[PDB]
């Protein structure tokens, strides 16, 4: 009859031991796998053979308010990570706590990919951070 309520104030995203707080007014999280699950190859005679793709990589895009503090805590993290050697790990699990079940995925071995594009104006423009993933696991409540 009625599905679960979706409260965006209860959604908490945490990466690298810090919590990313302060979300853009309109859209603040986007998870997408870089490749489809299967790609069917249709022969000239009409026969179909599936090709089950082996790439589970996804990209996580998160938007924060222009003046949010997290924007200046991820910048410091990125600056510290740049100075690191190659042998040190620069990735950690991207954890999303959503009691509504609206989100399905947790980023496995997520890493920072793109810095936000800074834009200033008479109005406020959000900053869009982009994260990678090793395997964007879609979990389910149903066992």
């Amino acid at each position: 009859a009625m599905y679960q309520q979706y409260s965006p104030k209860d959604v908490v995203c945490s990466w690298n031991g810090i919590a990313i707080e302060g979300f853009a007014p309109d859209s603040f999280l986007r998870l997408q796998r870089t490749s489809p699950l299967v790609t069917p190859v249709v022969g000239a005679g009409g026969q179909v053979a599936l090709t089950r793709n082996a790439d589970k990589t996804g990209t996580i895009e998160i938007e924060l308010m222009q003046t949010s503090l997290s924007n200046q805590m991820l910048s410091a993290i990125q600056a510290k990570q740049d100075d690191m050697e190659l042998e040190e790990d620069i990735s950690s699990n991207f954890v999303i706590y959503d009691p509504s079940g609206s989100v399905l995925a947790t980023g496995i071995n997520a890493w920072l990919q793109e810095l936000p594009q800074i834009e200033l104006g008479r109005d406020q423009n959000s900053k869009t951070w982009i994260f990678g993933c090793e395997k964007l696991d879609y979990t389910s409540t149903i066992p």
Partner: protein, 445 residues
């Protein structure tokens, strides 16, 4: 000098850092402290001679392809029983030199003569020691003697934890024996440091080994031991066997590893087995099919030939370890602890804890600027760090999957929030096995 170049004719050795460091509880008071670390065999040789058990264990440890960064040597509290068997005037009957802790020596001189028996001279030595004001505070004396026998037992009394009464000259018939159970030795060792993982002991008595394993099982460390009891090879029914390797299996001590080798007592081969997996990251290694350099197969006590299949079956039934001879290559087999648990599984479980503890301590210490509020955000950060540690475990090919369940902020009682503590977090993991044996068939037609 612009370029300082030194060329030596010594072969290069490789040192690797793994999880855990070995500790060897000896029975020698060469040093005054309880635990002293050594970084090579040469450093061990500076305080120990080639005939000491500690030097033998160190030599066995450092005969592997990696090096094992450091080795800790533990000292047991040892008592002394001074005897006399002679009783002849004064001559010298002296030079006891009860050292005691701190650094005092206060040696001893010729006690007496004139119809004086070992009882009289030993009682005089006890009285002289009690008279001196640098040793009576921390050293206790007890002249049981019981007539001619004349047993003069000395031991540490108070704060002074070091006692050494070595005496030159045939005049004094000193002895040196350990006077602590497994509990006393372990408590004394842990009072000094607790950053060691592998533990092995010089003492090979059945009672001490059994108690030591019993007390290790309650802790987060692994006890490595060796044995050369023939009765271990004879029986196959467990209830029937009552030797050291047997009761360990009977008691199900998952935290002890027993390796049956014919060179027990005299030598300590389990140190090489420790060094096999010590310098490698815990969980990613398979302790089963191990090749040890310089260690021969488990020879038979009588004919000095490798064991027959029946004896190996008996040892397997006792959940021990033996150095099998596969086609002429001496390989440690079954890599298992007394109790059926794989060594790598136990070490990996201990390492996971050490890693979860380290990661959460890193999160919870570096919060100098502010605080981690008890709302959902703090719980989410803690859960993320836990999941990161578990993913570190998975990437090592120790685990396969994992689930983490954390409580909501509204389901935590006020009693907990007051004590600023977070409880009842649960996580699960699924291991990934390793292959150690192959089953084969054949047709040929």
């Amino acid at each position: 000098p612009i370029v300082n170049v030194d060329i030596t004719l010594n072969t290069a050795g490789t040192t690797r850092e793994g999880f855990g460091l070995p500790l060897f509880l000896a029975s020698t008071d060469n040093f005054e402290e309880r635990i002293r670390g050594y970084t090579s065999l040469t450093e061990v040789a500076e305080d120990f001679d080639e005939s000491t058990a500690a030097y033998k264990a160190a030599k066995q440890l450092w005969s592997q392809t990696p090096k094992v960064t450091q080795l800790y040597i533990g000292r047991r509290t040892m008592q002394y029983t001074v005897s006399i068997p002679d009783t002849v005037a004064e001559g010298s009957e002296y030079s006891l030199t009860v050292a005691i802790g701190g650094g005092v020596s206060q040696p001893f001189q010729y006690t007496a003569k004139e119809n004086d028996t070992a009882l009289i001279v030993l009682n005089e030595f006890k009285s002289q020691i009690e008279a001196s004001p640098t040793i009576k505070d921390g050293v206790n004396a007890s002249v049981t003697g019981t007539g001619a026998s004349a047993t003069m037992i000395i031991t540490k009394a108070g704060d002074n934890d070091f006692v050494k009464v070595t005496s030159i000259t045939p005049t004094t018939s000193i002895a040196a024996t350990t006077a602590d159970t497994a509990s006393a030795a372990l408590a004394s060792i842990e009072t000094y440091s607790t950053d060691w993982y592998f533990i092995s002991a010089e003492d090979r008595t059945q009672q001490f080994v059994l108690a030591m394993a019993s007390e290790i099982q309650a802790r987060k460390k692994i006890f490595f031991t060796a044995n050369a009891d023939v009765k271990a090879l004879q029986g196959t029914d467990l209830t029937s066997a009552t030797d050291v390797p047997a009761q360990l299996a009977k008691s199900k001590y998952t935290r002890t590893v027993c390796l049956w080798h014919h060179t027990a007592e005299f030598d300590y081969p389990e140190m090489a087995y420790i060094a096999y997996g010590a310098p490698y990251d815990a969980g990613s290694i398979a302790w089963g099919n191990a090749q040890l350099t310089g260690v021969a197969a488990s020879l038979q006590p009588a004919n000095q030939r490798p064991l027959i299949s029946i004896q190996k079956s008996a040892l397997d039934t006792r959940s021990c370890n033996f150095i099998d001879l596969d086609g002429g290559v001496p390989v440690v087999r079954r890599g298992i602890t007394s109790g059926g648990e794989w060594i790598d599984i136990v070490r990996g479980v201990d390492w996971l804890e050490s890693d979860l503890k380290t990661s959460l301590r890193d999160l919870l210490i570096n919060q100098k600027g502010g605080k981690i509020t008890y709302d959902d955000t703090g719980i989410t950060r803690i859960r993320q760090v836990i999941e990161t540690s578990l993913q570190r475990a998975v990437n090592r090919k120790f685990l396969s999957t994992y689930t983490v369940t954390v409580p909501k902020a509204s389901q935590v009682a006020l009693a907990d929030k007051k004590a600023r503590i977070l409880k009842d977090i649960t996580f699960h993991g699924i291991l990934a096995g390793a292959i150690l044996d192959v089953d084969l068939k054949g047709t040929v037609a």
